[PDB]
Amino acid sequence: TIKEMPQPKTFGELKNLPLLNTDKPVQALMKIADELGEIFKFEAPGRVTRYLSSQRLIKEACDESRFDKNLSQALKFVRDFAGDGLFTSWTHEKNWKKAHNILLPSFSQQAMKGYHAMMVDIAVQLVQKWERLNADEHIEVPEDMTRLTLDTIGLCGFNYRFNSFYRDQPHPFITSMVRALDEAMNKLQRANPDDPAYDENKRQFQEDIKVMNDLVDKIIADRKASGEQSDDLLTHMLNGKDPETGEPLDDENIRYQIITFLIAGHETTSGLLSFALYFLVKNPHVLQKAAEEAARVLVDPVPSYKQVKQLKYVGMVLNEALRLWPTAPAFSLYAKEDTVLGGEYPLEKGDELMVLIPQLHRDKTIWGDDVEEFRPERFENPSAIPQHAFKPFGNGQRACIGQQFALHEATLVLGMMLKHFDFEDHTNYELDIKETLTLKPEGFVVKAKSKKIPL
């Protein structure tokens, strides 16, 4: 039977638009999903989308014969500086499939063996920072995790050191990138974007785009000039040819890919590490089990690629953190053709869906009644998880190309953190999830007591 779709409260001619005029729109949409269920319509002047929350419907949304990736307005604003890089391109753009084919082998699990040493370089810098704190000091967790992930992507992406652990004020590139991302997200809630109050925003935005383009174009040009071969993604992109077209990426698209790796990877990955450490300090028995694994496996001063692969419980901790607070919390799809969703909701060609990942990850028909509990052991037998129940890295050919990189990074770093320190939730921190591009536990702080194990 065709079913009428629920809709949240309306504001006359503004329809549902004012519901997203909030500091925490994803958390607001999760509460609407709690009230309305697995699907609801969201209307604004000149647009409609449908928010999906159940595995039953998201399994169908994930059918690539029926639905393709849509660029959300969020992605369209980011496209002003990420261009036709992989994250902000339509599947049908020539540069999407070309870059996908060229870059997939450079992002495989096997390829992580080549990035491992660079990841260890930055991870050791984090450990040494914390070893060097005085008794009276604490750790700003998301702040340090972001220094780590930015620097790791910079070193593995284009052999560039942002030297974030040497600074209070980030490298100008990072200052410009973070300010451009802030501006792109701020434009989602901006009613009068041509008001003169935004003249400075528009000028600063063009300045920040030029800062990013100028540095990355220079490093590409420096690399081509020198002929130097490194273990970075820039080497792979300069050397690569798409088997289909037989073409390489041009220098402009290479620049957009480098900017994209930093944008797509830095705050998702640092949020994952921040939420994982938050859940560990709030669940001491889970922290103890993860710390026992780190001590048994990481028997050398420097972790190896093989040792990171044997941090199985650490991997389960990270998957459980992605279950509860996936740091890229939504993605957008469009209907390729007229179709019926779930035997109940007719859609026309071009109709849009939003996947509300945190709500999917709370589907009690999949996970059971204990969905709010942090229980990594629920990932012990993953073959038992029904299709499309767990989607922190998106879907299909448009899924996260960085998934293996992010998880190798996060497993290495969390393993080293748990080997080298005991952690104290010294403030009894109250979770406050700040929403920007990403989700993070705002103001999460801990104290780290060294186990005095040499590097």
Ligand X SMILES: CC(C)C1=CC2=CC[C@@H]3[C@](C)(CCC[C@@]3(C)C(=O)N[C@@H](Cc3c[nH]c4ccccc34)C(=O)O)[C@H]2CC1
Task: Confirm whether 268 is a catalytic residue.
Answer: yes
Q: Which residues pair with 449 in a beta bridge?
A: 422
| CB proximity list for 50: less than 8 A, separation 6 or greater | 5, 39, 40, 41, 42, 345, 351, 352, 353, 354
How far apart CA 182 and CA 5 sit, in angstroms, is: 33
Identify which of residues 61 and 127 has a Cβ nearer to ligand HEM in the complex: 61
Identify which of residues 71 and 124 has a Cβ nearer to ligand HEM in the complex: 71
**How many positions of this chain bind ligand HEM (CB under 6 A)?**
26
Q: Check the annotation: does 400 bind a ligand.
A: yes
Out of 39, 86, 413, 418, the only residue in the binding site for ligand HEM (CB under 6 A) is: 86
Using CB distances below 5 to 8 A depending on partner kind, what does residue 393 bind out of ligand X, ligand HEM, Mg ion, none? ligand HEM
Identify which of residues 18 and 368 has a Cβ nearer to ligand X in the complex: 18
- Distance of closest approach, residue 317 Cβ to ligand X, in angstroms: 24
Residue identified by tokens 């029926």 is: 66
392 near ligand HEM, judged by CB under 6 A: yes
4 near Mg ion, judged by CB under 5 A: no
Task: Confirm whether 149 is a catalytic residue.
Answer: no
Q: Which residues pair with 41 in a beta bridge?
A: 50
Which residues of the chain form contacts with ligand X (CB under 6 A)? 20, 25-26, 47, 72-75, 78, 188, 328-330, 354, 437
Identify which of residues 25 and 396 has a Cβ nearer to ligand X in the complex: 25
Query: Residue 341 class from Cβ within 10 Å (0-12 exposed, 13-18 middle, 19+ buried)?
Result: buried
Q: Specify the 3-state DSSP secondary structure of 343.
A: coil
Per-residue DSSP letter, 378: G
49 near ligand HEM, judged by CB under 6 A: no
Cα–Cα distances in angstroms (integers) from residue 365 to residues 42, 325, 386, 394, in the given order = 25, 19, 10, 20
Q: Determine the interface stretch with Mg ion among 17-25, 74-82, 399-407, 418-426 (rule: CB under 5 A).
A: 17-25
How far apart CA 84 and CA 97 sit, in angstroms, is: 11
Candidate list 88, 146, 268, 269, residue with the active-site label: 268
**Count of beta carbons in the 10 Å neighbourhood of residue 450:** 13
Identify which of residues 280 and 400 has a Cβ nearer to ligand HEM in the complex: 400
Candidate list 393, 405, 423, 444, residue with the active-site label: 393
Q: Pairing between strand 67-69 and 330-335?
A: antiparallel
Q: Which residues pair with 424 in a beta bridge?
A: 447
Using CB distances below 5 to 8 A depending on partner kind, what does residue 315 bind out of ligand X, ligand HEM, Mg ion, none? none
- Distance of closest approach, residue 115 Cβ to ligand HEM, in angstroms: 10
27 near Mg ion, judged by CB under 5 A: no
23 near Mg ion, judged by CB under 5 A: yes
Q: Which residues pair with 140 in a beta bridge?
A: 445
How far apart CA 196 and CA 193 sit, in angstroms, is: 8
Q: Pairing between strand 47-52 and 352-356?
A: parallel
**129-158: contacts with ligand HEM (CB under 6 A):** 153
Q: Which residues pair with 345 in a beta bridge?
A: 341
Residue type, 114: G
Task: Confirm whether 400 is a catalytic residue.
Answer: yes
Binding site for ligand HEM (CB under 6 A): 69, 86-87, 100, 153, 260-261, 264-265, 268-269, 272, 322, 326-328, 331, 392-394, 398, 400-402, 405-406
Q: Which residues are annotated as a binding site for (9Z)-hexadecenoate?
A: 51
Query: Which residues are part of the catalytic machinery?
Result: 268, 393, 400
Binding site for Mg ion (CB under 5 A): 23
